[PDB]
Amino acid sequence: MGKSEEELSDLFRMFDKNADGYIDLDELKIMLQATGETITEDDIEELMKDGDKNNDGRIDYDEFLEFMKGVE
Ligand SMILES: [Ca+2]
Ligand SMILES: [Ca+2]
């Protein structure tokens, strides 16, 4: 779209893998495996702390809306 929130929502489905509705470290590591670069679970855990604003253990679309600005 390009009008406002519509573009990041396509990326949330891109970041989510099993259609669970949240972005999780298990989902982040699959993207790193597709990328073919060094994989570090502790690095993925640091990404979870930036992504999980409410410390609920999951990255939700609202947590992601702030998160997508951090990663483009
Ligand atoms: Ca997910
Ligand atoms: Ca969360």
Whether 72 has a binding-site annotation, put simply, is: no
Q: Which of 36, 17, 25 is nearest to 59 (CA)?
A: 25
For each of the domains in the chain, give its residue range(s) and CATH number, in order of start: 1-72 (1.10.238.10)
Method: NMR
* Nearest Cα residue to 42 out of 27, 66, 25, 30: 25
Q: How far is the CA of 69 from the centre of ligand 1 (A)?
A: 18
Is 58 known as a binding-site position?
yes
**What proportions of the chain, in percent to the nearest 5, are helix, strand and coil?**
60, 5, 40
Identify how many contiguous H helices and E strands the chain contains and give both numbers. 4, 0
Instruction: Answer yes or no: are the C-beta atoms of 28 and 47 closer than 8 Å.
Output: yes
Please tell me the distance between residue 19's alpha carbon and the centre of ligand 1 in angstroms. 6
